Design a binder for these strands. Structure first.
Ligand SMILES: Nc1ccn([C@H]2C[C@H](O)[C@@H](COP(=O)(O)NP(=O)(O)OP(=O)(O)O)O2)c(=O)n1
Ligand SMILES: [Mg+2]
Ligand SMILES: [Mg+2]
Length: 430
DNA sequence: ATGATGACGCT
DNA sequence: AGCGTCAT
């Protein structure tokens, strides 16, 4: 009736940088612009592991996780940029500093939630209201939306991409109800005008291009952001959800990419997100637990309430290095020396963090992985973090892990360690 | 033999 | 506290 809650209460955007680490290298090195290129770490192993790929290289099939020597078999002209190395390990400082540039611009428009090194959610609900007051009642012109796609449009009675975009935008604007300031579709439209400006400001002020999703919640905004990458934004309205979800594989919705999504698919015998609507909430809660069941029931209807959190800073700061296979650490002073390397990089980052952000970490988390063991982390142990001192931190990390040494011999380390990981957590104002 | 990270749920 | 999942 008049109480059916539609999940149209908010305007939320997700902004995500196109091939971010590649754009950072291309801004620095003009020779790599508008060319197939990739960013790699560790040149020694098969040319390096690829961690970011430009769209011109994607057209040859180059992907992340590929070795650079194999990528060159698909794309012989592929240009590479390699990540800085310090203290024997990959150092991502350049990309974190580029991330700060973007996050600071977006913060001028609205409350943002930093979601990764290259993306942030934006609650635009308030700015949409303000903007709607300011705009008397003047219609919204297609010229305000020069890079916006309206998902699901055009429909009903042009063979090139820009042609299709415009007709869908014209259809949307033609039907839009501009003298009725509570319509969620109007609010999304105004939200998309603001995200055009935010994206123009990012590119003008950093030279970085990006894509965006505009919708009513984080999940839809994230989904919408990927529909028309690169350098384009997509509005997913509440009404577009049934058709969009009818052929949307379950694994594409955020948090359904892993084991949970696989069991939804296998337990229910379904493929697409919209098929979930067939099930009562209690049924979904019986199969997947009370929170997953409630979430799924609403999400397959386009409704989700996870808020955009006001957080632009990480809660943790971490350094880790893998020692796969034959390089697994197997002597005590090898473990000590790498812990000192990690502690030294971490202390540099913490000190910068304390000066920029006026806070200190108070807990140190050591994590390790031993050979054979199957999981991301074999074992985590915590101690106090009272001094930004690299030697103290690596001393304390060794202290709390050294009893994992199954080794009989004095100087040996058994079983060999395939991963070390130092993390600073439990930040407090300073 | 991608790796280097980060957020958060569960018990 | 320590372990597990999901993510870029
Ligand atoms: N597994 C991953 C995924 C991304 N990244 C880094 C490199 C990416 O450039 C950056 C952002 O990831 P994305 O997942 O946002 N990829 P980008 O490379 O940003 O591509 P598009 O977002 O244009 O598809 O994070 C990473 O190091 N390891
Ligand atoms: Mg991106
Ligand atoms: Mg991203």
């Amino acid at each position: 009736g008049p109480h059916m809650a539609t999940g149209q209460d908010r305007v939320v955007a997700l902004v995500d940088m196109d091939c971010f680490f590649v754009q950072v290298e291309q801004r620095q090195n003009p020779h790599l612009r508008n060319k197939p290129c990739a960013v790699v770490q560790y040149k020694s192993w098969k040319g390096g592991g690829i961690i970011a790929v430009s769209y011109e290289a994607r057209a040859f099939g180059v992907t992340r996780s590929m070795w650079a020597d194999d990528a060159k078999k698909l794309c012989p002209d592929l240009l590479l940029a390699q990540v800085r190395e310090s203290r024997g390990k990959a150092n991502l400082t350049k990309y974190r500093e580029a991330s700060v540039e973007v996050m600071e611009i977006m913060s001028r428009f609205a409350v943002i939630e930093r979601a990764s090194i290259d993306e942030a959610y934006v609650d635009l609900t308030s700015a949409v209201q303000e903007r709607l007051q300011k705009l008397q009642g003047q219609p919204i012109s297609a010229d305000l939306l020069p890079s916006t796609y309206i998902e699901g449009l055009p429909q009903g009675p042009t063979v090139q991409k820009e042609g299709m975009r415009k007709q869908g935008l014209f259809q949307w604007l033609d039907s839009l109800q501009i003298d009725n300031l509570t319509s969620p579709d109007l609010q999304l439209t105004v939200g998309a005008v603001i995200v055009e400006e935010m994206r123009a400001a990012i590119e003008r002020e950093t030279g970085f291009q990006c894509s965006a999703g505009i919708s009513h919640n984080k999940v839809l905004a994230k989904l919408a952001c990927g529909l028309n990458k690169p350098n384009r934004q997509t509005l997913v309205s509440h009404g577009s959800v049934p058709q969009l979800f009818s052929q949307m594989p379950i694994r594409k919705i955020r948090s359904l990419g892993g084991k949970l999504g696989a069991s939804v698919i296998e337990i229910l015998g379904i493929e697409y997100m919209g098929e979930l609507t067939q099930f009562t909430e209690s049924q979904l809660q019986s199969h997947f637990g009370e929170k997953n069941g409630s979430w799924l029931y609403a999400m397959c209807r386009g409704i989700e309430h996870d808020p955009v959190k006001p957080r632009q800073l990480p809660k943790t700061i971490g350094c880790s290095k893998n020692f796969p296979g034959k390089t697994a650490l197997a002597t005590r002073e090898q473990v000590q020396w790498w812990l000192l390397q990690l502690a030294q990089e971490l202390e540099e980052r913490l000190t910068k963090d304390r000066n920029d952000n006026d806070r200190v970490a108070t807990q140190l988390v050591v994590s390790i992985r031993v050979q054979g063991d199957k999981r991301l982390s074999s074992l985590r142990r915590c101690c106090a973090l009272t001094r930004y001192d690299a030697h103290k931190m690596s001393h304390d990390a060794f202290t709390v892990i050294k009893n994992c040494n199954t080794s009989g011999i004095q100087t040996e380390w058994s079983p060999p360690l395939t991963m070390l990981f130092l993390c600073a957590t439990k930040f407090s104002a300073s």
